[model samples]
Each structure stands twice: as structure tokens, then as C-alpha cells.
Target: APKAPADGLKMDKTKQPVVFNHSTHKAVKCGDCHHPVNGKENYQKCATAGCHDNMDKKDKSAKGYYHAMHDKGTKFKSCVGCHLETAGADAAKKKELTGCKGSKCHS
Candidate 1:
């Protein structure tokens, strides 16, 4: 088996290199982000071809790399959407998570 990433996962495929730590999403299940096909999970990177491979943010299709993290309406919850919901009515946390720049996921 492949060794787990000890330093958290850094998505540097784009200009905005975001680090995703499993501990931050401690309450979330693996399948929530990994997703599945034919009852088995597919743990491939989101930017892989035939997935969220679109590099341009202007390409708003479901396959857009930005869409994978920013889109609101999709089968799997985007990071923004999940964080927004998790923050709820707490004004401080909401702004911290939903802001465009220097936010939890954007900075």
C-alpha cells in the first residue's frame, strides 16, 4: 500500500496551493471526499483527467478544478459549501470560511 502523507496534502497543481489537512476535517468521512464507483471508493486526485481537470476558473462545468472546491450545487459538497454549513450562524467563523481571500481555503 502507498504510504499516507504525513505533512497533510498540498494541492499545488494550480497557482493557489492549498493545504488540506485530514485533522481539520476530522468529523468528515473519507468517502465524503473520495467518492465511489461501483460500490468501491476511488481515491484519485481531483485534478486528474476525466475528473475535475479543467484549469480555467471560467470553465464552470462540473469538471472544473475550481468547481471541485468552490461550487455550491453538486453531488459531493465543495469545501466552501461544507465549511459554510459547518460555520452556520457564527458570524466570525462564517466570514473566516466564506471570504474570497485569506480565508480558510483560499489563502
Candidate 2:
């Protein structure tokens, strides 16, 4: 079997690294992060050259990995946005639903 990616990826742009526990998300759909590619599709880096290529671009419209995962405007379909959409209600009730710098996401 191929080796799984490490438990976490340290993102230079974000304050805290992304902590991915494949087991935690085993029940979730892969399209949550790997969209347009269905079951068992070969996984690729989010910032692959042709995909989210503009790492230095400041504009969110660029759709680069940074923007794709961090942009919080109306077009947010990224990690933080999706989490809010999915569990914001329960998080709010538990007082854990603060946006980005919230304790839930960051250290």
C-alpha cells in the first residue's frame, strides 16, 4: 500500500498548520477536499501547477491553494467555510464557532 501523507501539513501562509487525520475523516466524502474526483481517484496536491498555481497571487479570485482554502468572502468553499456550513450550528451552541482564529481551528 502507498504510504499515507503525514498527519499534518505545515502551511507557511497560515498561522497554524493543517491537521489531517485520515481516520477522522474516513467517513466523510473525499470530495470535501478532492472535488470533481470521485472514489479512489489518485490524489494530487491542492496547489498542483495547473490547479491552484498562483501561490504568490494576492487576489482571492486567483483560486490558488491559499485563496481556495482561506478566502472568506462570498465565494468561500474552502476548509473553514465548509466546516462552518456543516457544523457551525452545533459549534455555536457549544460556544466553539468563532471564525478563523477561533480555538476550534487554531491552537
Candidate 3:
């Protein structure tokens, strides 16, 4: 049962840094990003050690912050995942759905 404010951009400084815009995402409930706290709704940081850390390296269930917020997997709550969810794979692909790299997001 932990609570962290969902504000500012969470940046992953890997090969190509992935930036998450927390401000514009107010449309979604805090539970969307926070998941659940003690089986209830609350806010939590994805970078928390036991949570999504080290880009799928530390834990199996945890795919790291980047993958957790970028992968196209059904279980992943990534930005690209949401885009694909709303836009559909075909439309996303046709529009170059590569996430940050694709001029649509980062630029």
C-alpha cells in the first residue's frame, strides 16, 4: 500500500530515452497507471524496485519500466499499447506505430 504522485515525465535514459507525459494523461484514471494498492485504487510509481525495474532484467513478471509502458503485448500498459488499442494495429502500422521514434510521439 504505497502512494506516489503521478506527475512530470518519467524518462528512461536507455539507448533511446523514452519519455512519458504524465500531464496530458489526466483523461485516464489514476488506477490505470497505478494499477492497485492493497487491492484498492491508488497511485504508485512504475519505477519502484519491486515493480517495473531494469527493463525486464531483474524479474520475469516485471518487464521493466520501458517495456511496461511501451511493449505491444496485451498485458503491457504501454503508451504504444494504448495507441494500438485505440487506433488498431493496421492503422497504427500504416501510420508508423514505433512509439517515440516515429515522429508521431516524440517529435
Please provide TM-scores, in order, for all candidate models, with all chains considered together: 0.86, 0.60, 0.60
Per-residue error (Å), model 1, residue 2: 8.0
**If ranked by lDDT, best first, what sequence of candidates would result?**
1, 3, 2
Q: Per-residue error at 100 for model 3, in Å? A: 5.8
Find the candidate with the highest TM-score and give its number. Answer: 1
Global lDDT of each candidate = 0.81, 0.58, 0.59
Q: List the residue pairs that clash in candidate 3.
A: 69-78
Count of clashes, each model: 0, 0, 1
lDDT of 2 by residue, 17-89 (tens): 5555666556666655665543454467766667777766485664576677756553426766656666755
| Model 3, global lDDT | 0.59
TM-score of 1: 0.86
Judging by TM-score, tell me the better candidate of 1 and 2: 1
RMSD of each: 2.0, 4.2, 4.3
Best by lDDT: 1
Question: Where is model 2 poorest over a 10-residue stretch in terms of lDDT?
Answer: 93-102
